[PDB]
Amino acid sequence: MAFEPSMLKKKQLTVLDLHPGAGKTRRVLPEIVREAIKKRLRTVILAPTRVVAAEMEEALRGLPVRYMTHSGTEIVDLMCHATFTSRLLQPIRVPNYNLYIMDEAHFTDPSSIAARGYISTRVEMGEAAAIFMTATPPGTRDAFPDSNSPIMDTEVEVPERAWSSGFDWVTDHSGKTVWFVPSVRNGNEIAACLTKAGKRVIQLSRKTFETEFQKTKNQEWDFVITTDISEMGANFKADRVIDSRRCLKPVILDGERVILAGPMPVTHASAAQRRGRIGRNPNKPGDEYMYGGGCAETDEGHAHWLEARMLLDNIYLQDGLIASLYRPEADKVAAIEGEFKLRTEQRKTFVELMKRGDLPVWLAYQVASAGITYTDRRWCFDGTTNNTIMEDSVPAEVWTKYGEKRVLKPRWMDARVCSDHAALKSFKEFAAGKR
Q1: Among 36, 179, 46, 59, which residue's Cα sits nearest to residue 103?
Q2: Pairing label, strands 413-414, 257-265
Q3: Distance from the CA of 429 to the CA of which of 74, 86, 278, 320 falls in 20 to 30 A?
Q4: Rounded to an integer, what distance in angstroms lies between the CA atom of residue 313 and that of residue 340?
Q5: Sequence-distant contacts of 67-75: CB under 8 A, at least 24 apart
Q6: Which DSSP state fits 26?
Q7: 8 and 120 both lie in a single domain
Q8: SS3 of 14, please?
Q9: Where is ATP annotated to bind?
Q10: Is the CB of residue 367 less than 8 Å from the CB of residue 400?
């Protein structure tokens, strides 16, 4: 697609969907920003991560943009998706933007989903225009889209776990490989296997992305082992992508607990974004895409869209109106608008549990809605027996700040606080009352 100035008129929401590597960041985005500045539209640009934000700064070099992570007269702001949503939740002033530009608008994290819902509501009210940029917009059913250079697509058996024999083609490779895994724990086991095989490996996840991605730039490496976070703007100088074609789906069971279902097939959009990490250089043909499964569209019942409604139910708008989800995403949940609206006190705690507590949205809501205050950690230990958190098949214990050693057994079980080492470590600190 091509950008046209008429797309900036209020009530207009436009999806720009150039194929991967076609140049939406380096070419299209500055063109949009320049037009916005000329039309004196108060604008916000939304990047999925700080990595992409820094990339935009390079592309937008010389333009009066206020980077919110130098003049006072800038009318264009740039911040992260999560930063945008977080500010909407806080009782602080958010500008009445006339234009919203979201890069990587396919991002399926709750804060991004919420952002699109808020933005699309502002547009429909006639208060703004919006441009959503992504190579894989809603309705994407092509896993093998166009690329700057021909890609060698090959369906093969991809290791789901550490191996001691076979899969010679994996390690018998002299170039750089990006390997997409369904989880941190799984990637840790794959990475350990590769390291023992004498390969130089970098691991990427949401929590470690900003820091570890820097390693892909300052040293030689053979493999990058990454979760789906690398679908959201990360680029690598790689020759091969190995795609498990699998992911984990958070699912709210019984409205009492969250489990991680799967590993299960990824969406076509996800598959396309993973493959899209290579074949980006027109003058370098032959990049390989090794994939070991088909795709599936099962975002229905995915916890993230329910968590997005939890966020939007607590974002103020006008005369008690509540933002609906972005229309193509609306039927991924069944929750009623206003279902999760909290009182002022509980809402503050809700925000606090997410921000400072670093808890998943769903879990933060259970605690906050129960009227529990931030420093009250009794709930981390008083759950039913089947909520006992296990670590290497034994109950996870923690020495509390006033310890006394105690077993982790939360009143509400969200598997995401204990599915990998770093997550469990963070939750232990919280349960111990040290955050």
Answers
A1: 46
A2: parallel
A3: 86
A4: 6
A5: 75/36, 75/37, 75/40, 75/41, 75/42, 75/43
A6: I
A7: yes
A8: strand
A9: 18-25
A10: no
The dihedral through the CA atoms of 44, 267, 169, 149 has a sign that is negative
Establish whether 19 is an annotated binding residue: yes
Residue 310 and residue 216 share a domain: no
Domain that holds residue 174: 141-247+263-298
Of 151, 340, 142, 150, which Cα lies nearest the Cα of 241?
Answer: 151
Residue reference for tokens 């933005």: 119
252 and 393 inside one domain: yes
Q: Both 168 and 306 in a single domain? A: no
- Taking the C-alpha atoms of residue 96 and residue 60, their distance in angstroms, rounded to an integer, is 22
State both tokens at 95.
Answer: 């500008």
Domain final position from 321, 336, 351? 336
Four-point Cα dihedral 133, 123, 309, 273, nearest 10? -10
**Is 25 labelled a binding residue?**
yes
Co-location of 359 and 231 in the same domain:
no
CATH number at residue 164: 3.40.50.300
Of 220, 212, 213, nearest to 234 by C-alpha is 213
Residue (of 342, 350, 341, 417) closest to 380 by Cα position: 417
φ and ψ of 48, to 5 deg: -70, -35
Separation CA 224–CA 200 (nearest Å): 9
Q: How was this structure determined?
A: X-ray
Token pair of 160 as six digits: 């789901």
**Does residue 290 sit in the same domain as residue 174?**
yes
- For 160-204, give the DSSP string: SS--SSS-HHHHS--S-EEEE-S-HHHHHHHHHHHHHTT--EEEE
Domains contained in the chain, number: 3
DSSP string, 260-304: EEEEEEPPHHHHHHHHTTSS--TT---EEEEE-S------TT-HH
Q: Which tokens is 73 given? A: 């007269």
Residue 20 assigned as binding residue: yes
My answer on whether 154 and 71 are in the same domain is no
Residues in the chain: 435
